[PDB]
Symmetry: D2
Subunit: 268 residues, 4 copies
């Protein structure tokens, strides 16, 4: 009734109540969307997280590394939303790099099989999902994934940054494909957010010293950002994903909206 009114949207990436995907979905439903959810290997767990949302939604299994799951995803989605119905939107909210790729180990010690899995889940799957779901999206429709700005190097995030860089590259090619169906493809670049994955990634670890470093991030980002940033509130990010899912950005595709308080636009 208020933004995503009448729209049918698939949302992946819910693992905890802190998941950004969790907040995408809540906000999406507040704005009137019928959701299909997608989840990984704790189906038990996430189903329990899922019923805490404002409305009911089918929950499907998707191992983005599983060629079978992907191959049947369009069919399983259709049974959930009704034959003769298509999707209007798709949220890719998936990330993974093994620890060996992240603040722990030095950059050079991440083995390639590890980095490869990371890139598989974090960049490539954005294309898989497009391949799988694009055949059942409506014209006017929207695909959006979650990104962070990898344009400069930083401590800790290491191969996850590399993976995001690739993600941004994949998104411009996906958009050429999506364009044939009248569908947009975009990334949202968030500033940092205190999801359980984040507070875990690092700090812990590197180093150990700190979940006070998590606090320092939060304070520093809020400083850099002209309109401030609150790392504990995923709502501003979720509002941005929702705008891309609406009809209000009808001419933007293959890019990156930054929902980061404007921090990327300031040197300090």
């Amino acid at each position: 009734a208020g933004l995503l009114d009448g729209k049918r949207i698939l949302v992946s990436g819910i693992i905890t109540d802190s998941s950004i995907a969790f907040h995408i979905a809540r906000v999406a439903q507040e704005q009137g969307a019928q959701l299909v959810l997608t989840g990984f290997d704790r189906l038990r767990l996430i189903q329990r997280i899922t019923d805490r949302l404002p409305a009911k939604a089918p929950l499907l299994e998707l191992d983005v590394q599983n060629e079978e799951h992907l191959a049947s995803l369009a069919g399983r989605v259709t049974e959930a939303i009704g034959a003769g119905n298509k999707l209007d939107g798709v949220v890719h909210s998936i990330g993974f790099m093994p620890q060996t790729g992240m603040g722990i180990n030095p950059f050079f010690d991440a083995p390639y099989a590890d980095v490869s899995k990371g890139i598989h889940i974090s960049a490539y799957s954005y294309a898989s999902m497009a391949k799988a779901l694009l055949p059942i999206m409506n014209p006017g429709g929207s695909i959006v994934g979650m990104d962070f700005d990898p344009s400069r190097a930083m401590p800790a995030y290491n191969w996850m940054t590399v993976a995001k860089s690739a993600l941004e590259s994949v998104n411009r090619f996906v958009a050429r494909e999506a364009g044939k169906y009248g569908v947009r493809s975009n990334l949202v670049a968030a500033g940092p957010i205190r999801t359980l994955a984040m507070s875990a990634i690092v700090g812990g670890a590197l180093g150990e010293e700190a979940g006070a470093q998590i606090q320092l991030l939060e304070e520093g980002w809020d400083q850099r950002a002209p309109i401030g940033w609150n790392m504990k509130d995923a709502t501003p990010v979720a509002k941005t994903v929702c705008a891309l899912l609406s009809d209000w950005l009808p001419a933007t595709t293959g890019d990156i909206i930054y929902a980061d308080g404007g921090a990327h636009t300031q040197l300090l």
Copy 2:
């Protein structure tokens, strides 16, 4: 009922029914916004043009080069909206480069007095409007200005491109100020759009090679644009401006949204 319900927005830059400001305004009103309009020097023209908008809005004189128009702008707006009310939106849609600064006249032959005036009108004025209107805007407010991608050089557009490069820089500073009031400041980079002036120009009003170069760019644009581009429909651009004026992009500032068909993301 809509995107922009209850919002008090000032729109500048309407000169004819084909000005992009004209369609920003049309869309804003359809979306529940109450407007104040600003026009430059043909007020009788702007009066008859703006009478065709879906709802009546007061019209104020503002030459952006006029120190006194700026000094009085806040007062004059407050009169118009009711003392004790403030603006939720400002739209800067003003641009000009003298004839020596565009088209056939060689890049090197633009006199600095011409360049200076162009940058005055085209870049700096985004600061001055910011300075005048922020003392009367509400937190959560939005300032949006019109841009086009100047990261690469091109034929015909010449000093106007330089003007836009500066504007993108100005916008980043204005965001730091607007932050202090809880106000965002962003630009929309449009694709080429067929206004009166652009048509005359492609018609060869600034020489024929300038005209033919621009028509090439226009054709190339739509080809590259993964979702195509329609240079004769300013609506997709107006909707993007409204997206920024709304509460649904609350964490973007100092930034540029590309309402351009995805074109800047494709080499070819």
Copy 3:
């Protein structure tokens, strides 16, 4: 007498007399550099090809996907240059994407095992060579890898473009490591160059539309390039690589130099 007098540099990636590595090497020797060469799998080929260089240089086997070749690389180089000597330069000029990842095969149809191998060879390997050779490089040393601008998507190049996006990211991390040894790490973004493989490809070895798309890009390139571009002369590119290997760009790292005719700076 010249640019690179007394410098001990390792060059990889020579496969034929038209490999850009081949001309990097030719130019380096003309400029006083003493080389060690690395070749991948047709060593007898690389032997007869590299015998035509202005001076003899030892040739070492290195499959970048081979864990053992990397483990032994530092030892094998030291043998070759004399124990107690170190490298002043490393040139990474290696790239590969399987057939499913380029050309006519649809973007979406590349299997991840093909993409993974491409990124292995094309992006990650820049890390591993860095890891192997930095323990044996001198302060003031220079690592340079071969790139092309992937900031925008394009036809035919597909996953290879993604690979390069990742490489630019990797290069930024490698710079942080190379810093600790007083070593710079930069990439050179070349214009398109007519190697054996590129000619076969423009000849339609990966389908004809891929070929014709690439020839378009090549023509467009030279038109845009303010100083023109000659796709058949890899020398300007080799000189740029040498510029980075020299002491005359001592304060650039984590960075990309565009040896491309100025083309990426012009929309048209």
Copy 4:
């Protein structure tokens, strides 16, 4: 005899012995260049600074704001270097923004006439000098100006940043012109350097508190930079300008080499 050997180069922008232009010139002469110098209104003063260089060089007056000076510059340069001789290189090392545009006053309080002069001297003059000197440059030749990265906002530099943004835009157009003469146009982006202009600009002021802020800059940049940065040494910057003046970057034009220790490539 060693890099700029045989090359005739104009260098503008010498005001104190701390001037970057001062170090450009010294290094240029160390590498074998015959220089023409250009200076502003303290001809007395700078002549005295000038004789402290390694060799003798004609010194000419150039008020870049003076249309007369510019109009006769090519003629005055020819008499200094010999009829039938052309230049191979041009260093634009000129900057100016009035204080009202810099850390003192708030961003919005800089009047346009002030910002305009700033833009005139800092951006536009780069084109003037090209217009003036391009008719007497050799093919293969090089124009280079000094820039700093304006891509994000920062405290203090305010309208000087805006001016640099415009500078970068002007440089891509200059390159289209220069290209017709076989001449390259590029910018060097330096990290910060303790020239007398810098330590004065700001700190003093804003604020007052500190020339300890100058110290803090220096420490922080050296941190961000993978290879470190020493704000007291202009030699690394001067080496980079010299590389662009050489034949070793023959395919780069309309861009920006960063001589900033790699700081722009790291988020921290």
